[PDB]
Amino acid sequence: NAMDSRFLPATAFIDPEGRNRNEVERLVQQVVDLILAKLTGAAERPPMPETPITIPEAAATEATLLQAIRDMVDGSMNPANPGYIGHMDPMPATMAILGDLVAAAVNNNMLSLEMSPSFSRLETLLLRAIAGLFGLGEQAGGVLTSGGSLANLQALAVARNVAFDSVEPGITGLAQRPVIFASEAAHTSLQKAAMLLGLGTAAVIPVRATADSRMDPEDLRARIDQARGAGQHPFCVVATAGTTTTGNIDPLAEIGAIAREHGLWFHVDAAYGGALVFSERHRWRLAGIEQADSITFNPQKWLYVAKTCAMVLFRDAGVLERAFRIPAPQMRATDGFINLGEIGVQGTRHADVVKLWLTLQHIGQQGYARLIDDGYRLAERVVEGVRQRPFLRLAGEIDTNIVCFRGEPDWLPAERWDDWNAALQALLLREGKIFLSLPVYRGGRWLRAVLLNPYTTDAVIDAMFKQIDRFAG
């Protein structure tokens, strides 16, 4: 009985008959007290931190373990700091923290129903409910995936399988290259997925985006015609609802109409912007999404669910059985549910439905509508700050709570603007304790604000522009 031996610490596991209740309660409380201290005092740590691994033979002491946690926390990025305004990575909702505690504690497996009796059923039903908010219709549904890249991968795998019947024989027999279309501003997980799917990164054909970083439907139509002429076999168009760099939304209805005209799978990568389904004031921006063949949506971004939390939704969930699931005996439960492992890229999977369901209930649709509004308000203040300053330039109009801008100062030649913006970013972080990201975009370095932290204020944005004004004179 290993847990009686001198070879395991008394608290290595939790005795299911309570025999080490007191000792585990103590260890758990130390971690809990420490994490809560770090989080209720998060503003004491900056948005980014200032900075010999061996697996020990013998059990580490509580002191070593607590010190490691302390060092792990102190050396981590800190989106909780009101100054953290640079990424689609938010401080987590409290119930998402607690949801993951519960999930880890019960340690169920989304691979199959018998390994996750309630969570599998909860996830299937919750995702049907969400697919309904997107307007996908009564056959719609999907699966949670560990990150949006996997959601896009699985959407693209289904589009491919549908077009080429490739589940069993593969795609190596093809005389014509399969290709997909996406905005020149669409997410890189498309190229990574295209590589993984056997299509190659070059199978993702870029469609011109406007000055406001939205896909150009006229150019979509042109690229499809060009592809056919070159003897390629288009099978999918990806529209993006909230691009990663600038946060803009493609014209989903127009793009979707073109895809449908040409018999192409219509996927909407709504990883970020999908959260607008909870805002009546803003969801008109997603008009057209209801006719998608599939949708990628990431609650871990604008719904504040602790990473990872993402899903792929299909307007006809049965497609996962016809053009994804590998040949195998089909065992459905008496209440209709199926093993989720058969119809996802992953087999074993963490129960993300716990944090998702708990966060959605604690915040509510109105809670998210208000957060979404405040996000837009903060962003509009940044837009106005940039308009007021002639040495700054916007990337273009905004569609979400994201503002990409940069310095283009006339006291420097263009070739020096990348150093100016890197330097401004460094200065804002060092002296302002304000974190902006600095993506490459349109061949240059642009500053990027993602206004997500619930505790970011007008004053933080004003502090930013004062530092920018100092840096520029």
Site for a second copy contains 100 (CB under 8 A) = yes
77 binding partner (options a second copy, Cl ion, none; Cβ < 5 to 8 Å by kind): a second copy
Site for a second copy contains 463 (CB under 8 A) = no
Strands 141-145 and 310-314, bridge-based pairing? antiparallel
Site for a second copy contains 146 (CB under 8 A) = yes
- Please identify which residue in 58, 63, 211, 414 interacts with a second copy, judged by CB under 8 A: 58
3-state secondary structure of 84: strand
- Please identify which residue in 213, 243, 294, 308 interacts with a second copy, judged by CB under 8 A: 308
Site for a second copy contains 298 (CB under 8 A) = yes
48 binding partner (options a second copy, Cl ion, none; Cβ < 5 to 8 Å by kind): a second copy
CB atoms within 10 A of CB 436: 27
Contact segment (CB under 8 A) with a second copy among 206-214, 285-293, 372-380, 393-401 equals: 372-380
Burial class (CB within 10 angstroms; exposed 0-12, middle 13-18, buried 19+) of 24: middle
For Cl ion, the closer CB: 355 or 445: 355
Site for a second copy contains 186 (CB under 8 A) = no
Could you tell me the two tokens for 349? 């999977």
Contact segment (CB under 8 A) with a second copy among 104-112, 209-217, 385-393, 415-423 equals: 104-112
d(CA 271, CA 273): 6
Burial class (CB within 10 angstroms; exposed 0-12, middle 13-18, buried 19+) of 335: exposed
For Cl ion, the closer CB: 191 or 296: 296
Site for a second copy contains 115 (CB under 8 A) = yes
Q: How far is the CB of 242 from a second copy (least distance, A)?
A: 15
CA 367 to chain centroid, in Å, comes to 20
Site for a second copy contains 228 (CB under 8 A) = no
For a second copy, the closer CB: 39 or 253: 39
For a second copy, the closer CB: 225 or 280: 280
- Please identify which residue in 137, 170, 390, 444 interacts with a second copy, judged by CB under 8 A: 170
For a second copy, the closer CB: 207 or 460: 460
Site for a second copy contains 460 (CB under 8 A) = no
Site for a second copy contains 168 (CB under 8 A) = yes
Q: How far is the CB of 106 from Cl ion (least distance, A)?
A: 14
For a second copy, the closer CB: 238 or 394: 238
Site for a second copy contains 178 (CB under 8 A) = yes
CB 403, CB 397: distance < 8 Å: no
Buried b (16+ CB within 10 A) or exposed e, 167-204: beeebeeeeebbbbbbbebbbebbbebbeebebeeebb
Position with the least CB separation from Cl ion: 350
Contact segment (CB under 8 A) with a second copy among 29-37, 286-294, 390-398, 462-470 equals: 29-37
Buried b (16+ CB within 10 A) or exposed e, 269-285: bbbbbbbbbbbeebbeb
Burial class (CB within 10 angstroms; exposed 0-12, middle 13-18, buried 19+) of 141: buried
d(CA 439, CA 461): 20
For helices 417-430 and 458-472, the axis angle rounded to 10 degrees is: 130
Could you tell me the two tokens for 185? 């501003």
CA separation, residue 415 to residues 396, 419, 441, 444, 445 (Å): 21, 8, 15, 9, 11
Site for a second copy contains 237 (CB under 8 A) = no
